[PDB]
A paper describes a structure:
We discovered the existence of non-canonical flagellar filaments in Achromobacter sp. MFA1 R437,38, a soil bacterium that was identified as a cell culture contaminant. Like the EHEC H7, the Achromobacter ODS is also formed by interactions between flagellins that are five, 11, and 27 subunits away. However, there are four flagellins in the Achromobacter ASU, with two up and two down conformations. The key distinction is that all of the EHEC H7 Sn:Sn+27 dimers form at a single radius while the Achromobacter Sn:Sn+27 dimers occur at two different radii. The ODS surrounding the EHEC H7 and Achromobacter flagellar filaments produces an intermediate waveform that is not adopted by the “canonical” S. typhimurium and E. coli K-12 H48 flagellar filaments.
The rotating flagellar filament primarily functions as a propeller, acting as an Archimedean screw, and supercoiling of the filament is essential as rotations of a straight filament do not generate thrust. Here, we show the atomic cryo-electron microscopy structures for flagellar filaments from enterohemorrhagic Escherichia coli O157:H7, enteropathogenic E. coli O127:H6, Achromobacter, and Sinorhizobium meliloti, where the outer domains dimerize or tetramerize to form either a sheath or a screw-like surface.
Residue numbers in the entry:
A (entry chain X): 510 to 558
B (entry chain X), G (entry chain j), H (entry chain u): 2 to 51
C (entry chain n): 408 to 509
D (entry chain f): 52 to 204
E (entry chain f): 459 to 509
F (entry chain T): 52 to 153
I (entry chain n): 103 to 153
Write the structure that this text describes.
């Protein structure tokens, strides 16, 4: 019973951890892409001269 | 503004990327270790209970 | 420029040069606990060799580093702004004198 | 100028704080190892407190206790960070200056994890459990029929 | 006496001493965890103010 | 002449409004993380309101919450914008003149 | 953040994997030998009793 | 929508997985113990009768 | 967190910067006038006839 008590507070719920990791990876790829496009935001300024 | 010296959008994107990466880091640590409460900074009282 | 007749207490300007502070040597503790009015201030020896109730001295370090840096910033910014204003006024004088010459 | 100073001083302050996280992480890891040592000590202490074990098995148990306590003291005296004995008997709290316009800090308040400060200091299950005495006091000297002879003699 | 040590003689309540040590260690560990939380929150706040 | 005065003053007013936008951004950003502090405090209050936690762990929760409150106070005191503690104890409403003709 | 010269996540994953493999090794040794008290580093007084 | 921060489908799947896992645990416990009324929380009156 | 040696290196860098500031003061010259220096009286800049 005490081992179950420890599991209820200490062991990680794999089902939610996998989903959290997946969403984190998705956010990472999206962030890298949007950061790139933000880096080409000032490029349009380098058209008129 | 059409200025190039500083890019506020790039800075905001960097911040959100860092937040997502920190979430990924804690998720990866909890996935690898198999313990939700390690590095007590998450659920400090929980580690005392455990 | 010093005065012998009038002295200054630790916190005040008192004519009485000497107070006869009362300290008790705490037996088995070897610490000169205060007795007169502080009543256990745990006297420490100051940097000048006299007895005092403080524990930590000034040391040897810029006590307010960033505040002094901000003061330097303010002085430099004031001078730079004054020079810029004089420069703008001088440019206006250039324009006015050129017009008057014409 | 004011904004440049503030923004880049805040970047430097972020660097200082981020070093603070690393310091706390190292100290927390050392404390976790001490925690595992205490867990093992408690397990084998519950084992040794049984009366069925003869004296020599208690001697072996105490040998393992001494090894664990020595390792705890080693962790205390050897956990280093930037040449600072962070988890030792001489470790004043840190400052971690965060933000420009100094006057605000983040006190760490980390110190005193070792034997003789976790309270064990003599932990023993058998005969061999040598503890520590205290410096004799002048009050004690007088108490046991002290007779003065001179300057504290 | 002169020598600084003496026999321990079967430390009275072992598990109570161990539990006191556990309480002290867990208190300090929880303080450090709280400091880590505060410090990462400061990191986020300072980054926001920097931007 | 009147048109130049109006256009130049109104452009400067646009700059002033931009300064106000930036100040609002800083204040909102600081408040956004004070929000996370309050969220964590609420979550841990829910956790520690349980009776299964003995006094030592409630003390640990209280210590962490004390850290959170001290951090909120630090945010209030240290949040600065052009030498103005905008989100602090002494923060009067600003003016932000937009348009000429005071 | 976006640093690559050190991968802290890889390090913690490796450490946790090493702990898991140590547990697996102890379990495998106990299974093959059939003795819980083997390699006196495990239950030192236990092997004295045995 | 097209959101990524929250995945409602994943949460629903996790909940159904938890319910199925609880049912499986009860089934395994009943098989291993061999008594339908064990851990009295189920059929408390049945426990009193037994 | 910085020990004494790193603080000493920081102080060396700060001393270098201060020496540069002092150098800029002593050597910023304009027509033989150390304009941004410790001996720089305000100038006149006669602008116009009828002195």
């Amino acid at each position: 019973n005490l081992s179950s008590a420890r599991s209820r507070i200490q062991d990680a719920d794999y089902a939610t951890e996998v989903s959290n990791m997946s969403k984190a990876q998705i956010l990472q790829q999206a962030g890298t892409s949007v950061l790139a496009q933000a880096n080409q935001v000032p490029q349009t300024v380098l058209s008129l001269l | 503004a059409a200025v190039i010296n500083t890019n506020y959008l790039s800075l905001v994107a960097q911040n959100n990327l860092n937040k997502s990466q920190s979430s990924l880091g804690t998720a990866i640590e909890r996935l690898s270790s198999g313990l939700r409460i390690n590095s007590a900074k998450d659920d400090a009282a929980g580690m005392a209970i455990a | 420029g010093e005065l012998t007749d009038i002295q200054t207490f630790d916190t005040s300007y008192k004519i009485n040069a000497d107070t006869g502070e009362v300290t008790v040597v705490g037996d088995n503790s070897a610490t000169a606990g205060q007795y007169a009015s502080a009543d256990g201030a745990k006297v420490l020896v100051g940097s000048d060799g006299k007895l005092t109730t403080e524990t930590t001295s000034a040391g040897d370090k810029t006590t307010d580093p960033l505040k002094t840096l901000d003061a330097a910033f303010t002085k430099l910014d004031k001078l730079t702004g004054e020079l810029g204003a004089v420069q703008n006024r001088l440019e206006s004088t250039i324009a006015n004198l050129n017009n008057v010459v014409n | 100028n004011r904004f440049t100073a503030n923004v880049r001083g805040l970047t430097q302050a972020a660097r200082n704080a981020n070093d603070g996280i690393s310091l706390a992480q190292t100290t927390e890891g050392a404390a976790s190892e001490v925690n595992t040592h205490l867990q093992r000590i408690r397990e084998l202490t519950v084992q040794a407190s049984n009366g069925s074990y003869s004296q020599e098995q208690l001697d072996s148990v105490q040998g393992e206790i001494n090894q664990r306590l020595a390792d705890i003291d080693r962790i205390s005296e050897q956990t280093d960070f930037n040449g600072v004995k962070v988890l030792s008997d001489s470790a004043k709290p840190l400052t971690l200056q965060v933000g420009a316009n100094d006057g605000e800090t983040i006190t760490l308040n980390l110190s005193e994890i070792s034997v003789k400060t976790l309270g064990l200091d003599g932990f023993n299950v058998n005969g061999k459990g040598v503890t520590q005495n205290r410096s004799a006091t002048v009050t004690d000297v007088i108490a046991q029929g002290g007779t003065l002879q001179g300057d504290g003699t």
